[PDB]
Design an enzyme around this catalytic site. Structure first.
Site, PDB file in Angstrom:
ATOM      1  N   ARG A  71       7.783   6.759  -2.729  1.00 20.35           N
ATOM      2  CA  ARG A  71       8.051   7.417  -1.471  1.00 20.35           C
ATOM      3  C   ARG A  71       7.490   6.570  -0.376  1.00 20.35           C
ATOM      4  O   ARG A  71       6.546   5.830  -0.616  1.00 20.35           O
ATOM      5  CB  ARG A  71       7.314   8.726  -1.391  1.00 20.35           C
ATOM      6  CG  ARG A  71       5.805   8.488  -1.349  1.00 20.35           C
ATOM      7  CD  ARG A  71       5.018   9.649  -1.432  1.00 20.35           C
ATOM      8  NE  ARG A  71       5.160  10.296  -2.667  1.00 20.35           N
ATOM      9  CZ  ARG A  71       4.338  11.216  -3.125  1.00 20.35           C
ATOM     10  NH1 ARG A  71       3.250  11.540  -2.448  1.00 20.35           N
ATOM     11  NH2 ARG A  71       4.625  11.799  -4.270  1.00 20.35           N
ATOM     12  N   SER A  78       0.775  -1.237   0.000  1.00 19.74           N
ATOM     13  CA  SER A  78       0.000   0.000   0.000  1.00 19.74           C
ATOM     14  C   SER A  78       0.805   1.284   0.000  1.00 19.74           C
ATOM     15  O   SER A  78       0.670   2.105   0.897  1.00 19.74           O
ATOM     16  CB  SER A  78      -0.855   0.012   1.235  1.00 19.74           C
ATOM     17  OG  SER A  78      -1.737  -1.059   1.255  1.00 19.74           O
ATOM     18  N   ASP A 102      -3.603  -1.597  -2.927  1.00 22.85           N
ATOM     19  CA  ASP A 102      -4.697  -2.081  -2.132  1.00 22.85           C
ATOM     20  C   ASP A 102      -5.940  -1.637  -2.836  1.00 22.85           C
ATOM     21  O   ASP A 102      -6.957  -2.325  -2.845  1.00 22.85           O
ATOM     22  CB  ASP A 102      -4.573  -1.578  -0.685  1.00 22.85           C
ATOM     23  CG  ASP A 102      -5.344  -2.441   0.325  1.00 22.85           C
ATOM     24  OD1 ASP A 102      -5.783  -3.435  -0.103  1.00 22.85           O
ATOM     25  OD2 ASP A 102      -5.446  -2.133   1.552  1.00 22.85           O
TER      26      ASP A 102
HETATM   27 MG   LIG Z   1      -5.507  -1.734   3.305  1.00 22.25          MG
END
Ligand SMILES: [Mg+2]
Ligand SMILES: Nc1ncnc2c1ncn2[C@@H]1O[C@H](COP(=O)(O)OP(=O)(O)OP(=O)(O)O)[C@@H](O)[C@H]1O
Ligand SMILES: OC[C@H]1O[C@H](O)[C@H](O)[C@@H](O)[C@@H]1O
Ligand SMILES: [Mg+2]
Ligand SMILES: [Mg+2]
Ligand SMILES: [Mg+2]
Lengths: 500, 500, 500, 500
Positions: B179, B164, B218
């Site tokens: 990043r 994620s 995600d």
């Molecule tokens: Mg999640």
């Protein structure tokens, strides 16, 4: 019979007299119950309208004063206010910085009330109030010299004034003196406005900048100070949160006050009861003049020594009969009268031939301070043997070893009588308002100020014991904490001035 | 003025500050419209080639990632695949048995990301990826111990990896970290291939048998999982058949993705656009980094509390400004900053003298979980009175009755601000692609994963309300269903690995 | 019979099962007395020499550990010491600045024990102690980075180590692990020196500068911390001065310790008893492993749910039977087993067809935290209606209105059973040592640490009630105050290190 | 090291500081001899003409005042005279009926000097003398109301005035104030005629009928009173007849006087010496300002605590250095400074963090009365344990058991230092005039007034011991009786007025 056996026969005679006195003094639970019940009956009468022929200067019974505070602090109150406190052996001026966290920072100046104001019926209102104003100048010069230097332009200072006398209060701002008690005889202030006299003298002395904002009692100030301090805001998961119910004074005199429902004060005008109930002002702090309880003497355990103080030595005979059994001034005086009487019976001060040869400080009234009694009672084995002599030597009365133990027994009997009677008004108040069961849970706090309760080496525990003996029972004692409102009157008056 | 009237004056001061905050927080439709329009403008810019001086590590604006999925499932996909999911407060490993009937059977092991990886800039790529590989061994030992026992000879296991973080994806198989955000500070993985680091650690730990097949987000996994499940194959005579358009994450952070036409992604190389359009790959799933919306702050309803989180408390100041108003980590942090600031103003935590005396967990950042906020907001009358205290007692912060209602008002204002801003990207996406009118009939589905949307007692309804308020209007809200992609990321990664 | 009447017939069946459970759980004073008496009998046995065939790893009965502290602080202790605290759900490191006025300033870093150390029998001593050493480096980097930067030359740091496991202590400096309990299964540290393992890892990680000075328990640290704080030095004229007698832990597990006469510990070598009595070391702090009370189950109110936890779910079956009824880990687990069993009976979770369809977090052991129980029990009318659902929704278990009230009844029955059993060791200790009457006057303090006693919304009051019910009676309860040793273990270990 | 051993290490540190102080305080015979010899040298200088640059307001050294009494009574003096006595903590008015048989009947009224006259440099001569005149009216109203009622026509009343300040006496009738000492700061009376100020105020208040006949010191009045009383006229066959030599004051300050040969007072004008010797007036009573002995500090056993009182707390720094070691005001102040200093060293008042937290009455100068010291020193075993606490509780300073014994040691060291130094002037006077050998036989009497010598439980015996240690030796002690001039100043002034 050797000299030693003849001496023992004499000692037995001395002992019997001392034991008789000790038994006359001890308060038995049977009387503690008659007194609690009577106290409650007089409390109801004390809230009732007067009958024809009655006034406040002359009332008898147990009068109550409906001080117009109508609530209690929670510790968040903040600001810097002055406070004056008159009426014990001394006078105090404070500058109290209320911080809003249940604490305050107090500056203080104090002085003894000069005897010029106490021993003479010809003392006027200008001497007493002139005194208070002069001490106020001294206070300002030490803690707020700039306000004094800048006055009249610097302004206002807000001052609360605790005045420990029954006051016919009409507003928190003012009321009149009902009577002098506890050592003052200044007749020309009776019936006059207490604040007005003080306020005028402050201007007379150069302080037009200080305004007296509130007139309060010591009992009220103590209750409010107690409420302001500690917490009473714990978590509801700590299992139990306490609430202040009763304030006490056990100093030169004795009193207290409690929170009461406004709808029960039948003597207060109905129009005022309606004005206040409409704003949610469901309760008032009522000064119960405990000192006056049973002035007519139907139940108190009176002995001949109490009769003498009340009829011959006191500044106001016929009034404040309860105080004469309980407060610091009379714990002192009762011992003195006993020692003089046991001189007359030939039992203690056997070396004198007769009363005129006794030390002058022994025969002079009120020269035996309750401070000496404190040391007399605390003293254990070697204290009794050596210090009891030093303590009475300071009253110019040298004693024998056997005399010293007999004196100590008398002292303990005197302080016990007081400590048990002193529980009567606390039990009576908690019972009358059902403080113990108005809520399923939550402790009951009693915030007591005054040097007898704070320092006498025996009151904290004797009151707890006596409360358990009274109708409160052990179960009531378990709810009830006696805490000391140490900075009590000072903070209280500052809060009263904050309230205005 | 009684103590109770003085206390009310204080309560009014407290109320005014709380109401001012609540009004600063509420999002009015006028801003909801400026934001929807701005979001769309930034979305177009997010698909454009960069200007000189721009890169992905440092971009600003609302970047989009052209994840190479290029299509959606219909529920017939079958097979057993592993899935890893990193990046919230935790990490999950699943074994998902896709059955081909819009359902799956999921096995799961999960663990918290240890703080050893979050609170220190000196944490390396080997600690994070070493962690993931060790948890992978634990998973295999519980659900597929035989494959682990038989590896290296047993093979292959196909694993999808949901990571994620923004990833500069070049192929569904791999890409690099742009990043770190949301709590990670592991600088030496920025710019590195995410799969390569994980794959090497899996071999290092003894699992050369597991191949990472696909790297996904995600948001993407959620969309695909949502598409896989329910039906969307009803009869054409039932009157209307829905289609998935937008996937969401409302967890520690906030994001979503949507299906977009390939011919509009002007930054993608034209040669790639041609290669794909020739095979009928007319659409791509685009990760819209909602969190970055309006990083420059031209339109978001920023207050001083958001400035503090972004400049002083966050791990990546200047970025992810939208998340700081919307996601679970910051719903928590915003309340904490308000309570500390109302301490400084002397309005709520009035008992402390000053900040240094506050409970250490109140002054420490991120100790107030959005989980507490969930309970604070749902609580009704007796919940507020009793449970609000328990909830803050767990943060070592005991409160008063009046304080508790004021805190609840602040909490509802915070979650409302978030729920309305949270609607901006959903309205903006549906409007930009004309999801509502590309077809005469057929409903619009939004498949949202994440614990804030799944459990916060207020988001499901506040988003529906906010969508109706936004430019979608009531008519757009009528097409749009918010459903929960409960097993969302896990299934999604398994499908991505199936796709390869 | 309408649908509503048929539904009521079902609800009555549900209610009967819940009431049966509640009655099985409630502890009646008759058992509270059998247990107090049995606890005392086992306490005497716990001080006796072992019989042939007995050891500490396998003992049964109620063993005691003669921790070599031999005294208590008075608040004047001063200095800055480190403290480590292992064994709950977490681990803490403190730096405690003892000031010498009954207070201290504590710095703290804390972290969760990673699951890598709890769910696997193949975890070694190097993983647990390596963990503690790494967290120690993190602590030093935040609070004393200079000492770490200057070490090896900077020295010494003195660290106390609280290790919440039975330890066969031979000196305050060291001892060995008797068994793992409460979630740890790391078999290769049993029988090894606890300090030696920690000390070696501290050097391995780069901190040869930190010396572990003392090894203590949590119960001991709590007692000493409690003793250090408040006053216990009031005036002898305040009427009564309290003394600390018992320390408690009510956290993930349950324990306590108390001061005991050295001449009664018959298992301690006589030569050691003589060495110590000669220096005036008349007392020792004894760790009473309350958790082990009645491991053989002759008196505890055991039900089938407790049998399941002890034989099937626990990490150490057959041991710590008392904890399984009292401590936070098992308050949680007992509810979970009841809900699953009432699923099987068809009374609560009626919508599932059968156990395999239940939410995975409901069937998985230890996923129901006592934290949820805290909220379930405190909730009043609207809390029960709305928040109970949120609380169980977080365990993925949606419920009906009628189900929620039935669950709450079960929760209150569980916490009450614990709170009353939890009083058994406090009554038993005070009675065995005659803490209530060894002195005419002076209150008895119990200093309890641990999150269940500190936060569970019901323990503070339920223990006070249970103490009054036990043989202590109301009279014993009146002497006994339950106070919270909030910074308990940290300060305690710092004091142990000061003592050395 | 157990907590108890660590506590003992602290107690040893406390003890060493207390023992160091006790040793600094004890006066060894070697210094007692240096001081006796120095005292005599300064006495000779004190009778000499001044050098250029010297005056009485500023002198240094040990000045003497040649009071013009020139003789002593024998007990036959008769008549009723008034007496005023100013300058201690109080003021007294007596009416003394001298009967001519070595006894008198004394009536008395007394009052405290109001603080209005002591704490402010801006107090004027009219406030002090106005006070004395008002108290004189009060006296007359109680004992001689008829003279007051009949005045101005009733006359004369003859009053003696004892004024306890150095007075530059020119005639028994009058003299001027040299300096204020001992608490007064009323600068505008320095250099003025003491009688003139009092006499004018008596007329101002309505009593022109009272004439001040004689101005005397307290030392002189004491000597004469002592001479008047007992016998000193026994049979010459009883074997030995005593004679009065030295009068003493040991009260708030310390002084004495003695009979000296007129031919040795070299500073008195020769013409006056001749006028008087011609009438047989061979001796004068000389006030030796003992308080000033060694003001330059060449021999007194000065410690840092005495330096603080003299330079920072006293009303007249640089003067009366002997009193600062000996008299009642400074016995009190020295203990207070020690307790505050041992607070700063962390040895006694260990519970405070730092000086600002100490009880306000402990840090305020002169609040520790020598009256408390009297009780602190006399207390034996149980007195020390219980009463020492009560005594310091009255100064709001609660203490521990171990602290109380350490405080008592300091108190005994302080009073011993004083009692031994206090013997220096008695030995020095008897030796200078050869009182011991001017006659073959006849005892030497010293008539000492003042509450420290009369009540401090230790001075009567410590002076006798110290006299034996001084150069008088045992042989001198055998001639020397210390008797108490109880009614001392009152009778003395009445006799001075009789003398005129
Ligand atoms: Mg999640
Ligand atoms: N240590 C002591 N032990 C016993 N009695 C004491 C002690 N100190 C003071 N008292 C008594 O207390 C009196 C002073 O009371 P206190 O200090 O409470 O002042 P107060 O508040 O002004 O009294 P009140 O409120 O009744 O006017 C003294 O006259 C003496 O009788
Ligand atoms: O943490 C509480 C307790 O847990 C376990 O029961 C241990 O046996 C015990 O030594 C510890 O004190
Ligand atoms: Mg008072
Ligand atoms: Mg613990
Ligand atoms: Mg004198």
């Amino acid at each position: 019979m050797s000299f030693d056996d003849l001496h023992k026969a004499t000692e037995r005679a001395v002992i019997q007299a001392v034991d008789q006195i000790c038994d006359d003094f001890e308060v038995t639970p049977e009387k503690l119950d008659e007194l609690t019940a009577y106290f409650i009956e007089q409390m109801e009468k004390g809230l009732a309208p007067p009958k024809e022929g009655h006034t406040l200067a002359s009332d008898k019974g147990l009068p109550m004063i409906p001080a117009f505070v109508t609530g209690s602090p929670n510790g968040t109150e903040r600001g810097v206010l002055l406070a004056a406190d008159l009426g014990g052996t001394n006078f105090r001026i404070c500058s109290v910085n209320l911080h809003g966290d249940h604490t305050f920072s107090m500056e203080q100046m104090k002085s003894k009330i000069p005897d010029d104001l106490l021993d003479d019926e010809n003392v006027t209102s200008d001497d007493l109030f002139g005194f208070l104003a002069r001490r106020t100048l001294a206070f300002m010069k030490k803690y707020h010299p700039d306000e004094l230097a800048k006055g009249k332009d610097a302004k206002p200072m807000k001052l609360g004034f605790t005045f420990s006398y029954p006051v016919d209060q009409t507003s928190l701002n003012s009321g009149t003196l009902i009577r002098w008690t506890k050592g003052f005889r200044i007749a020309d202030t009776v019936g006059k406005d207490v604040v007005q006299l003080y306020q005028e003298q402050l201007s007379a002395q150069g302080m037009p900048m200080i305004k007296v904002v509130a007139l309060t009692n010591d009992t009220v100030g103590t209750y409010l100070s107690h409420c302001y301090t500690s917490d009473n805001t714990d978590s509801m998961t700590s299992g139990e949160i306490s609430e202040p119910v009763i304030g006490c004074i056990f100093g030169t005199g004795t009193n207290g006050c409690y929170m009461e429902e406004i709808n029960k004060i039948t003597k207060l005008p109905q129009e005022l009861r309606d004005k206040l109930i409409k704003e949610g002002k469901t309760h008032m702090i009522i000064n119960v003049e405990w000192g006056s309880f049973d002035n007519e003497l139907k139940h108190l355990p009176t002995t001949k020594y109490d009769v003498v103080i009340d009829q011959k030595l006191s500044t106001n005979p016929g009034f404040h009969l309860f105080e004469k059994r309980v407060s610091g001034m009379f714990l002192g005086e009762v011992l003195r009268n006993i020692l003089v009487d046991l001189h007359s019976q030939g039992l203690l001060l056997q070396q004198y031939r007769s009363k005129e040869q006794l030390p002058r400080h022994l025969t002079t009234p009120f020269q035996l301070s309750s401070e000496v009694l404190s040391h007399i009672e605390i003293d254990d084995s070697t204290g009794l043997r050596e210090t009891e002599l030093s303590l009475l030597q300071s009253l110019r009365l040298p004693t024998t070893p056997t005399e010293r133990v007999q004196i100590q027994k008398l002292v303990r009997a005197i302080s016990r009588r007081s400590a048990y009677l002193a529980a009567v008004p606390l039990a009576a108040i908690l019972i009358k308002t059902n403080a113990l069961n108005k809520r399923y849970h939550g402790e009951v706090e009693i915030g007591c100020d005054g040097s007898v309760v704070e320092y006498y080496p025996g009151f904290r525990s004797m009151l707890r014991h006596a409360l358990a003996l009274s109708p409160l029972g052990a179960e009531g004692e378990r709810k009830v904490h006696l805490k000391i409102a140490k900075d009590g009157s000072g903070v209280g008056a500052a809060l009263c001035a904050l309230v205005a």
